[PDB]
Design a protein around this ligand. Sequence first.
Ligand SMILES: *[C@@H]1O[C@H](CO)[C@@H](O[C@@H]2O[C@H](CO)[C@@H](O[C@@H]3O[C@H](CO)[C@@H](O[C@@H]4O[C@H](CO)[C@@H](O)[C@H](O)[C@@H]4O)[C@H](O[C@@H]4O[C@H](CO)[C@@H](O)[C@H](O)[C@@H]4O)[C@@H]3O)[C@H](O)[C@H]2NC(C)=O)[C@H](O)[C@H]1NC(C)=O
Ligand SMILES: *[C@@H]1O[C@H](CO)[C@@H](O[C@@H]2O[C@H](CO)[C@@H](O[C@@H]3O[C@H](CO)[C@@H](O)[C@H](O)[C@H]3NC(C)=O)[C@H](O)[C@H]2NC(C)=O)[C@H](O)[C@H]1NC(C)=O
Ligand SMILES: *[C@@H]1O[C@H](CO)[C@@H](O[C@@H]2O[C@H](CO)[C@@H](O[C@@H]3O[C@H](CO)[C@@H](O)[C@H](O)[C@@H]3O)[C@H](O)[C@H]2NC(C)=O)[C@H](O)[C@H]1NC(C)=O
Ligand SMILES: *[C@H]1O[C@H](CO)[C@@H](O)[C@H](O)[C@H]1NC(C)=O
Lengths: 21, 165
Amino acid sequence: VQCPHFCYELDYELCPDVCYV
Amino acid sequence: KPKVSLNPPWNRIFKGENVTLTCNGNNVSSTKWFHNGSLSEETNSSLNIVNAKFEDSGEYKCQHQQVNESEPVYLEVFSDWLLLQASAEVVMEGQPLFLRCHGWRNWDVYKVIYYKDGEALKYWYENHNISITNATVEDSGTYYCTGKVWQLDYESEPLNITVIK
Ligand SMILES: *[C@@H]1O[C@H](CO)[C@@H](O[C@@H]2O[C@H](CO)[C@@H](O[C@@H]3O[C@H](CO)[C@@H](O[C@@H]4O[C@H](CO)[C@@H](O)[C@H](O)[C@@H]4O)[C@H](O[C@@H]4O[C@H](CO)[C@@H](O)[C@H](O)[C@@H]4O)[C@@H]3O)[C@H](O)[C@H]2NC(C)=O)[C@H](O)[C@H]1NC(C)=O
Ligand SMILES: *[C@@H]1O[C@H](CO)[C@@H](O[C@@H]2O[C@H](CO)[C@@H](O[C@@H]3O[C@H](CO)[C@@H](O)[C@H](O)[C@H]3NC(C)=O)[C@H](O)[C@H]2NC(C)=O)[C@H](O)[C@H]1NC(C)=O
Ligand SMILES: *[C@@H]1O[C@H](CO)[C@@H](O[C@@H]2O[C@H](CO)[C@@H](O[C@@H]3O[C@H](CO)[C@@H](O)[C@H](O)[C@@H]3O)[C@H](O)[C@H]2NC(C)=O)[C@H](O)[C@H]1NC(C)=O
Ligand SMILES: *[C@H]1O[C@H](CO)[C@@H](O)[C@H](O)[C@H]1NC(C)=O
């Protein structure tokens, strides 16, 4: 699952869980 | 015999969204709410879920002064890019069925395609709901959708929908 940069660039995580860890 | 209803009607929702379960108000006294078997501290005919957490998922029931409890209503909280929402997962032949390819944080979804049993049913450039006016037993099957959020392609978890007589 590919996510946009901002999901990781920004301070707070705005993207779905599937993007993290 | 009472009955719980949702507003919006979506049993499946995103982490953080809001939903309100209503105990069939007809025929005042009190209303008992059961979440996962446990009695909730709510007394109104309408239980308000706010900023939905995974924890909020589960079985819900309400009890009035009609002795018997209401039929169970299952609510599920997801956290993905697109979530296929259904007006109901068990439809009675003849009634309407509404499907919505819902996007995370309401963000825009383009190139929306709804599939059934692996087959692409409809395409829409701008996100659009799919509406089955007269449900048929043929309309049963596993549905899902795909779309594009933030320029990237995403697929939704599949959902089994059954149309009985
Ligand atoms: C009412 O009943 C409901 C069922 O009818 C029940 O729903 C279930 O609640 C769970 C939370 O209470 C739901 O979430 C699951 O929680 C775990 C815990 O955070 C979460 O991550 C896991 O965290 C653990 C500790 O933090 C870790 O040890 C574990 O490895 C995992 O990380 C789950 O997400 C996971 O994501 C992973 C990838 O990131 C994936 O590999 C895992 O398989 C898992 O998906 C998970 O969300 C659970 O989904 C609910 N079940 C359903 C069917 O919805 C309600 O909680 C009940 N509520 C009350 C008040 O009784
Ligand atoms: C789920 O329901 C929540 C309502 O309980 C919504 O969250 C709250 O939305 C309010 C407005 O969006 C926020 O409060 C105020 O909002 C107004 C107008 O938007 C601002 O002018 C105020 O400054 C602001 N108040 C403060 C103190 O900043 C709430 O802060 C906000 N969160 C909570 C916990 O109340 C959700 O938006 C709603 N979700 C959906 C999808 O409808
Ligand atoms: C939604 O509907 C689909 C389609 O009917 C269901 O898929 C079916 O799931 C069952 C298990 O729940 C599968 O049967 C099992 O298969 C394994 C492997 O062969 C076997 O070891 C078990 O003993 C059992 O027979 C079945 O094959 C599978 N069929 C298909 C086409 O996928 C699905 O379960 C439903 N989803 C949910 C959440 O209920
Ligand atoms: C489905 O029900 C409708 C009522 O909205 C009826 O008019 C129609 O004939 C039915 N369709 C079929 C294929 O039986």
